[PDB]
Design a protein around this ligand. Sequence first.
Ligand code: A1I70
Ligand code: A1I70
Lengths: 193, 193
Amino acid sequence: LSTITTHHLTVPPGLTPEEFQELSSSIAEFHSYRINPGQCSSLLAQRIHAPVETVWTVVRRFDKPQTYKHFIKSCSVGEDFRMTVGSTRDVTVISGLPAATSTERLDILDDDRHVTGFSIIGGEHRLRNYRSVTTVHGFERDGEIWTVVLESYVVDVPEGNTEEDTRLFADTVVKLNLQKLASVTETLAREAG
Amino acid sequence: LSTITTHHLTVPPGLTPEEFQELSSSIAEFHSYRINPGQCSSLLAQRIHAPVETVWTVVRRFDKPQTYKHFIKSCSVGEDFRMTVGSTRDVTVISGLPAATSTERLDILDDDRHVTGFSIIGGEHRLRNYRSVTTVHGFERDGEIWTVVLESYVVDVPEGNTEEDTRLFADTVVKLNLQKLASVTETLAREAG
Ligand SMILES: COc1cc(/C=C/C(=O)N[C@@H](Cc2ccccc2)C(=O)O)ccc1O
Ligand SMILES: COc1cc(/C=C/C(=O)N[C@@H](Cc2ccccc2)C(=O)O)ccc1O
């Protein structure tokens, strides 16, 4: 039958137990999925030495994912684009396969709570029915500030793939992109503006 | 007909004109290929704030490419392995496709000149007949030291791929792995040993 993900019940890679205790309710609220056989789901975390709003300024830009994500040749949103839920983008993917475009829909965008997410709704690639949520969270300790970004997804496991290799793949990509996010926004922080 | 690559005649991404002028002869010697229609070739560079021998200690470890390369699930060399030209490794690749192993042969290993290279000799993936060379080079300016790593390859362009997308893919992967090499060996340098 279907089941609920348990991301909110264990400490994910990249997070401390202290940070987890502060985020458990957010993980439950935004990073929970009902998951069916044949799907995989994961939660990744990344610490960033930058203020929450600096990081959020990059995370929220649905029209420019290539600012922090790897393997993007181009991203188009057309002309009428406004940052509203329901908007779509066409991402041309860099892969060893022939050309492929991923069409992606903006599912969530909450600037007050720092939540966004999207769904892959078409394209010929290996993350069919992918859906993902990213949240941004601030931390402080004796005047020092930092941010944690949480990114979770659910996706279908292709016929002939094992669950483990689909999850390893998607996890590897998400982890690399959060590392890029960390570099980009830490640079932005060092420089001000 | 066949032609020679011109990597040694222009400044590659990631290198300064001053650094190029010092390396042009090495690019000619080690990063030249005779290339046929249907193949692509590229030269990438990466500056590393670490001594040449620190970087070389990681670059030369043919049995542990996952120390600096991305998307490696495992790498096996068996039991009799000695670091000699002709040895092979089986690299299990992380991809969105079903399981695949790349069998790779060590083509060059010169510890005096800091040159190594390998050939993909089998496996079902999209870099057929890939062959690559990596060289490591030291620089100094008023007591400050740094290293440049050059990595070139030639590879077949799969039927139905464009040249541009094969090169974009292989370039993206090589560039990410050299960035990882830079982080790993800069950390090793900061810590000594
Ligand atoms: C970069 O952004 C995105 C990336 C992806 C990539 C998915 C995928 O399956 N990629 C495969 C290559 C591949 C295989 C077969 C058909 C097409 C592509 C891989 O890399 O192994 C999806 C949405 C995105 O927004
Ligand atoms: C990580 O190390 C290596 C990586 C590669 C990857 C090659 C390749 O074509 N990868 C594809 C995915 C893919 C597609 C179809 C069949 C198998 C795989 C991609 O990612 O789009 C080769 C040698 C290596 O040593």
